[PDB]
Amino acid sequence: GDTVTVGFHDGPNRHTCTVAHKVEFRPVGREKYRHPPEHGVELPCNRYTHKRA
Amino acid sequence: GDTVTVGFHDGPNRHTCTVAHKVEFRPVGREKYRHPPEHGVELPCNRYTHKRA
Amino acid sequence: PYIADCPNCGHSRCDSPIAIEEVRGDAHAGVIRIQTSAMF
Amino acid sequence: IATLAPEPLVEHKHRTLILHLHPDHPTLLTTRSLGSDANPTRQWIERPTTVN
Amino acid sequence: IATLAPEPLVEHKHRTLILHLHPDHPTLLTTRSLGSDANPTRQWIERPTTVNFTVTGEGLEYTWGNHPPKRVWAQ
Amino acid sequence: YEHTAVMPNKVGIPYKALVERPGYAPVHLQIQLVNTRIIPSTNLEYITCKYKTKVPSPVVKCCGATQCTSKPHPDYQCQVFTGVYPFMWGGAYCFCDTENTQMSEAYVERSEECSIDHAKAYKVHTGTVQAMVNITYGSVSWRSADVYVNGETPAKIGDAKLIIGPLSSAWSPFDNKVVVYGHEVYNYDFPEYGTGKAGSFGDLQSRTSTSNDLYANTNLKLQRPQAGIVHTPFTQAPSGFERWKRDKGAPLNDVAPFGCSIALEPLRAENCAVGSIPISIDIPDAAFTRISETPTVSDLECKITECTYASDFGGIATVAYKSSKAGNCPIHSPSGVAVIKENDVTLAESGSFTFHFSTANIHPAFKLQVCTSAVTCKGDCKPPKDHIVDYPAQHTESFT
Amino acid sequence: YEHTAVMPNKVGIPYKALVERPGYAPVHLQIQLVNTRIIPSTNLEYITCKYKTKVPSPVVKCCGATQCTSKPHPDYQCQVFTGVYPFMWGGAYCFCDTENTQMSEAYVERSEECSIDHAKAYKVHTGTVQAMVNITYGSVSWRSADVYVNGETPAKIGDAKLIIGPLSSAWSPFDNKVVVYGHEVYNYDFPEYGTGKAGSFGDLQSRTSTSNDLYANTNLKLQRPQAGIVHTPFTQAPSGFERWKRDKGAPLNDVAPFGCSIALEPLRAENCAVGSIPISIDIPDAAFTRISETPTVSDLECKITECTYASDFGGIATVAYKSSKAGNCPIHSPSGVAVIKENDVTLAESGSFTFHFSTANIHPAFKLQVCTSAVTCKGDCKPPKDHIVDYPAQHTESFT
């Protein structure tokens, strides 16, 4: 996405926040997808964790 | 869309499902639109029915 | 309503009843016919 | 969980690989002629292409 | 329920079929010299007749009425 | 009076020849080859379409092997796999850890679109061309009949018997090998049934839609499912019917020569304007008028008045008609220089009536045969200004 | 190892070529073109059959005229008649004597036999020839598959992939124009639909059996009934389908050239033995035996013992086999002089085994390739005595 656009809903109001940021997702590999598939080989990508510890 | 992403809402949970699939929509014709218009000529496209019978 | 293994079920590979097989973006009219493993 | 491009169609010729090729997405193909003359090649392929 | 003509009398000669022949009724005989030169023959035969056929090297065929077609190596 | 006539193959324009029967009054033709639909001899060789890897559901033996067999499904790819731990709704379920076996099997099958959205190959021979020839004949004024080209076929529809062709211009715009798709026809060297390389056109090759047997070189290669989960990696070329719809070639109704149009209908190639057709008609003698009843028109004079050196019937010429009786008088220029809009002109007792025409030579020295009276309508013509609309009536270009 | 091979078109005899793959053991062929059914491209032009003058019952107006009209029935012949006095069961019944009018009408109609007993014209093009080629291959020992001739079609039935033709001998024994009758096929210049002269072939000309429209030039001419009696003189040529069954010509399965048989079935012309076919096969490499496993046979000797200068496999020759291992050994004469009945010979440790063959040269100097070991089986042959039975296995006549 050209931008990033964030927001919750308190309940009385939308109350969001939005920003510019150049985003892309190349997967690691000589394939230039636009999105991760369900299958294919695994290989060493860079990525953030689920966790807090 | 590069993918396809499906999901209902049971009510307690989002509970969706998503998948990779290369999607496009060329209309039939020498025009390479991205979307069907409101007007223009009719001509023999390929398409699925509304129905069950 | 069948249940199968969705590939990126929000987080990752769950087993959703709406597990998507046979996506068909092969027509022209902005339409896709899909099969969930769920039988609505 | 990551990418994979559809397999190639290997075709023989005399000291020459014709390869009818047909990817899903833009794929960077490349080679290395293992002589001390490397003579490599690079090309992103998204359009299906018979190469040599 | 249908016709049938009495069998022929096959007689050998050098690349030649003499055929003493003796039908019941008028029988259309005919042949096909299987060269690309066809050289066929037709004749209704009701009177018994010794006939001849210059068979070639590759073969000839022979049709005694609706009796099935025969075939012949004449080397 | 069986009026033989060589005749240019061109669709949308009449060819108003003139019957010069010695003895009775001549009669004009108006032969408009409204269509030139062809319908060559052909053969349905194989439908193709995009596959569907309609995977049969894999076997999972929990402790030990399950040997696969080569079932007779088209391109029945099957490969046993071990070393799984298949997460299925309860975590894994097979209690072993390497003896967990998974047998994946996948065969190729015609899509549901194969019935309806499908390319279609052909071995194309020459066949026999046709036409709905209108003749608004003489005083008959009508027949719109479907005919042939083979030069002994009549078609007694109306009252006239007419024999056409065979045409000399045997260019079948179809090549020998043709692919066909919905309406866009491609004179493509399709590889063959039974052979088509995967990814290339005809990866799926079914004889027809009903034909359960086919040839599916799709390079379908199953791979083992990942990390102890139930699924079926099918690694496969998307079809040579998928491409061939967006990396194809252009259609023969957009790349043919010598002027043809096409249909997915009897596989005709309409309106192919090329060459000539030796056409010959046997008129009904009843339709003739005897010579002693039409006015004799001689001792006349003809002259252009505003000749337009053009396609549309811009050329005009008054004619000082010098009749004997009064009535109709069919007209024609036996020279092909001038093409005339009027087949027939009405005449009072020696009046004058302009007609319309079109020419191609600056000095049109064309004879005009006004019902057995020849005349040179010599003169000079003017070029027009306004040339962007459909096809001409002149079709007579030569040395000028 | 894709074993190209020119190959004579001849039906009932194998063609046991030899695969000389460099590196592994050779393998024999056994290519028997069991059929050469042709199926040219054709077009149903019109059925014909004998008419039936299915007379509609005439009108009889008793006092005054009844003008007839030209109804659109095929060959609707109708002629008013006066001057009758029609005796009908009570003597006459119309009380006038000259104003008694009788209107006879008769049209032509397809017989009931037209559906079933009917000649059938065709415009015949060339199409594409076929065959149920058996190969009892190698050690595979079987495949009986239906194939084509066009030189890029495989047929992967069995395990081998085989490409045939195109044959050089393009003689379609069918002519361009053909008539067909039940089973007897006549390469006849049928006149055309729409034209056939009455009495001549195709007096009735219906497009098909269902086609209500037709062309009936029967010269149907009604005459007045005689002496005041009800009936309908229809004076007509009995059909050109009546003749054409007893003053016809002979059938193409009895007059064709270059050796064909025929069927009213897909309109094939079976077993047309003429010319050669450039045939090429891609064997399964699994079927090969590697070279280091078959016995090497060299240091042998070959000689005829009773060579029969003939067609049937009368030629024989012992071979002093000098093997290394013991087993099978495929055999073939790469020279076409000798045709051998045995594809394969079993071998103990350097024994001797006669085979059978046939030749055409008095001094057969043909090589014999016993699984990569050549040898001249020179000798001399004897003529036979007993030559009246079907076709040969020799088919190798040349200068001798």
| SS3 labels along chain G | CCEEEEEECCCCCCCCCEECCCCECCEECCEECCCCCCCCCCCEEEEECCEECCCCCCEEECCCCCCCCCCCCCCCEEEEEECCCCECCCCCCCCCCCCCEEEEEECCEECCHHHCCCEEEEECCCCCCCECCEECCCCCCCCECCECCCCCCCCCCCCCEEECCCCCCCCCCCCCEEEEECCEEECCCCCCCCCCCCCCCCCEEECCCCCCCEEECCCCEECCCCCCECCCCEECCCCCCCCCCCCCCCCHHHHCCCCCEECCCCCCEECCCCCEEEEEEECCHHHCCEHHHCCCCCCCEEEEEEEECCCCCCEEEEEECCCCCCEEEECCCCCCCCEECCCEEEECCCCECCEEEECCCCCCCCECCCCCCCCECCCCEECCCCCCCCCCCCCCCCCC
Structure tokens given for G275: 């010319």
- The alpha carbons of chain C give a radius of gyration, in whole angstroms, of 11
Chain A residue with the nearest C-alpha to that of C14: A38
Cβ <8 Å between F41 and G128: no
Cβ <8 Å between C20 and B18: yes
Cβ <8 Å between B19 and A36: no
Cβ <8 Å between B18 and C6: yes
> What letter would DSSP give residue F253?
H
The residue assigned the tokens 């032509």 is G108
Q: Output phi, psi for F294, to 5 deg.
A: -85, 145
What lies within 8 Å, CB to CB, of F61 at 6+ separation is: F94, F100, F101, F102, F103
Interface of chain B toward chain F, CB-CB under 8 angstroms: 22, 26, 44, 46
Query: Are G251 and G263 within 8 A, CB to CB?
Result: no
What lies within 8 Å, CB to CB, of G28 at 6+ separation is: G16, G17, G18, G19, G138, G330, G331, G332, G343, G344
Give ∠ CA G238-G244-G249 in degrees, rounded to 5. Answer: 155
Chain A residue with the nearest C-alpha to that of D5: A31
Cβ <8 Å between F117 and B46: yes
Structure tokens given for G177: 């124009």
Peptide bond into F72 cis (omega under 30): no
Give ∠ CA F57-F61-F63 in degrees, rounded to 5. Answer: 165
- The verdict on A26 touching D (C-beta cutoff 8 Å) is no
Helix/strand/coil for F203: coil
Interface of chain G toward chain E, CB-CB under 8 angstroms: 171, 250, 253-259, 273-274, 310-311, 386-392, 394-395, 397
Cβ <8 Å between F191 and G152: yes
Query: Are F149 and F163 within 8 A, CB to CB?
Result: no
d(CA A48, CA F105): 36
- The verdict on F232 touching G (C-beta cutoff 8 Å) is no
Cβ <8 Å between G311 and E73: yes
d(CA G270, CA E57): 21
CB atoms within 10 A of CB F294: 21
Helix/strand/coil for F255: helix
Minimal CA–CA distance to F74: which of F243, F211, F201, F200? F211
d(CA G347, CA G321): 8
Interface of chain D toward chain A, CB-CB under 8 angstroms: 1-5, 23-30, 44, 46
| Beta-bridge mates of residue G131 | G147
Chains D and E touch (3+ CB pairs under 8 A): no
Query: Are F209 and F118 within 8 A, CB to CB?
Result: yes
Evaluated on CA atoms C12, C14, C16, C20, the torsion sign reads: positive
Cβ <8 Å between D27 and A45: no
Q: Output phi, psi for E21, to 5 deg.
A: -140, 145
Which residues of chain C lie closer than 8 angstroms to F229, CB-CB? 5, 13
d(CA F32, CA F156): 17
| Beta-bridge mates of residue D16 | D13
Name the minimum distance, in Å, from the CA of F76 to any CA of chain G. Answer: 14
Query: Are D19 and D8 within 8 A, CB to CB?
Result: yes
**Minimum-distance CB partner of D4 among A32, A40, A45:** A40
Query: Are F172 and F166 within 8 A, CB to CB?
Result: no
Evaluated on CA atoms F348, F349, F351, F357, the torsion sign reads: positive
Chain B residue with the nearest C-alpha to that of F251: B30
What lies within 8 Å, CB to CB, of G168 at 6+ separation is: G275, G276, G277, G278
Query: How is chain E classified by DSSP, letter by letter?
Result: ----PPPPEEEEETTEEEEEE--SS-EEEEE---SSS---EEEEE-S-EEEEEE--SS-EEE--TTSPPEEE---
Q: Output phi, psi for G286, to 5 deg.
A: -60, -35
* Helix, strand, coil abundance in chain F, percent, nearest 5: 5, 30, 70
- The alpha carbons of chain G give a radius of gyration, in whole angstroms, of 34
Cβ-Cβ pairs closer than 8 A, B with F, add up to 7
Minimal CA–CA distance to B5: which of G326, E74, D31, A35? A35
**Minimum-distance CB partner of G257 among E17, E36, E75:** E36
The residue assigned the tokens 């059909």 is G239
Minimal CA–CA distance to F373: which of F329, F339, F336? F329
In terms of C-beta density within 10 A (0-12 exposed, 13-18 middle, 19 or more buried), how is residue F395 classed? middle
Name the minimum distance, in Å, from the CA of B53 to any CA of chain C. Answer: 16
Report resolution (Å) to 1 decimal: 7.3
What lies within 8 Å, CB to CB, of F313 at 6+ separation is: F339, F340, F341, F356, F357, F358, F393
Helix/strand/coil for F113: helix
CA distance readout (Å), B48 to B7, F52, G347 = 21, 17, 68
**Minimum-distance CB partner of D47 among F197, F238, F247:** F247
Half-sphere exposure of D4 (CA within 13 A, CB side): 18
> What letter would DSSP give residue C31?
-
What lies within 8 Å, CB to CB, of G351 at 6+ separation is: G321, G323
| CB crowding A26-43: b at 16 or more within 10 Å, else e | ebebebbbebbbbbbeee
d(CA F280, CA B6): 70
- The verdict on G125 touching F (C-beta cutoff 8 Å) is yes
Q: How would you classify residue G195: left for phi > 0, otherwise alpha for psi between -120 and 50, otherwise beta?
A: alpha
- Pick among G147, G195, G213 to test the F interface (most F CBs inside 10 A): G195
Which helix or strand (DSSP H or E) is residue F320 part of? strand F315-320
Which residues of chain D lie closer than 8 angstroms to F200, CB-CB? 9, 20
Name the minimum distance, in Å, from the CA of F270 to any CA of chain G. Answer: 19
CA distance readout (Å), G10 to E32, F35, F51, G80, G397 = 16, 46, 40, 65, 14
Query: How is A19-40 classified by DSSP, letter by letter?
Result: EE-----PPSSSB--SS--SSS
Which helix or strand (DSSP H or E) is residue A3 part of? strand A3-7
Give ∠ CA G296-G302-G307 in degrees, rounded to 5. Answer: 140
Name the minimum distance, in Å, from the CA of B39 to any CA of chain F. Answer: 22
The residue assigned the tokens 């006095």 is G85
Helix/strand/coil for F123: strand
Helix extents (H) in chain F? 252-255
- Pick among A33, A39, A47 to test the D interface (most D CBs inside 10 A): A33
Q: How far is CA G196 from the centre of its chain?
A: 28
Structure tokens given for D2: 């990551």
Structure tokens given for F79: 């490969």
CB atoms within 10 A of CB G7: 20
d(CA G154, CA F197): 12
Query: Are G68 and G78 within 8 A, CB to CB?
Result: yes
Cβ <8 Å between D2 and A28: yes
Helix/strand/coil for F189: coil
Minimal CA–CA distance to F150: which of F42, F39, F261? F39
d(CA G78, CA G69): 8
CA distance readout (Å), F138 to D17, F68, F134, F142, F294 = 70, 80, 12, 9, 14
| Beta strands at F51-52 and F109-110: parallel, antiparallel or unpaired | antiparallel
CB atoms within 10 A of CB F102: 26
Minimal CA–CA distance to F192: which of G194, G82, G156? G156
> What letter would DSSP give residue F252?
H
Query: Are B21 and B31 within 8 A, CB to CB?
Result: no
- The verdict on A41 touching D (C-beta cutoff 8 Å) is yes
Which residues of chain A lie closer than 8 angstroms to B3, CB-CB? 35
d(CA A42, CA D4): 9
Query: How is chain D classified by DSSP, letter by letter?
Result: ----PPPPEEEEETTEEEEEE--SS-EEEEE---SSS---EEEEE-S-EEE-
Query: Are G190 and G179 within 8 A, CB to CB?
Result: yes
Whole-angstrom distance between the N-terminal and C-terminal Cα of chain D? 31
- Pick among G124, G130, G150, G178 to test the F interface (most F CBs inside 10 A): G150
d(CA F123, CA F156): 34
Which residues of chain F lie closer than 8 angstroms to A43, CB-CB? none
d(CA F172, CA F272): 9
Cβ <8 Å between E35 and G392: no
Helix/strand/coil for F198: coil
> What letter would DSSP give residue F208?
S
d(CA F80, CA F98): 13
Query: Which chain B residues in 1-53 lie under 8 Å from chain A, judged by CB atoms?
Result: 2-3, 19-20
d(CA F262, CA F252): 8
- Pick among G387, G395, G397 to test the E interface (most E CBs inside 10 A): G387
Query: Are G186 and G201 within 8 A, CB to CB?
Result: no
Which helix or strand (DSSP H or E) is residue F346 part of? strand F344-347
Which residues of chain F lie closer than 8 angstroms to B26, CB-CB? 246
Query: Are F134 and F162 within 8 A, CB to CB?
Result: no
Helix/strand/coil for F254: helix
Query: Are G51 and G219 within 8 A, CB to CB?
Result: no
Helix extents (H) in C1-40? none
Cβ <8 Å between B19 and A38: yes
CB atoms within 10 A of CB G67: 7
Peptide bond into G233 cis (omega under 30): no
| Beta strands at F301-308 and F381-382: parallel, antiparallel or unpaired | parallel
Query: Are G241 and G142 within 8 A, CB to CB?
Result: no
Helix/strand/coil for F302: strand
Q: How far is CA F39 from the centre of its chain?
A: 8
**Minimum-distance CB partner of B8 among C18, C19, C25:** C18
Q: Output phi, psi for G292, to 5 deg.
A: -80, 15
Structure tokens given for B29: 């014709």
**Minimum-distance CB partner of A33 among D3, D29, D44:** D3
d(CA G285, CA G289): 8
Structure tokens given for F360: 């191609």
> What letter would DSSP give residue F372?
S
Q: How far is CA F238 from the centre of its chain?
A: 32
Q: Output phi, psi for F215, to 5 deg.
A: -130, 115
Helix/strand/coil for F32: strand
Position G137: which residue type?
A: Y
Query: How was this model experimentally determined?
Result: cryo-EM
| Beta-bridge mates of residue F356 | F316
> What letter would DSSP give residue C3?
-
Whole-angstrom distance between the N-terminal and C-terminal Cα of chain G? 33
Which residues of chain F lie closer than 8 angstroms to G42, CB-CB? 41
Query: Are G103 and G94 within 8 A, CB to CB?
Result: no
The residue assigned the tokens 């003529």 is G383
Which residues of chain C lie closer than 8 angstroms to A36, CB-CB? 8
CB atoms within 10 A of CB G26: 22
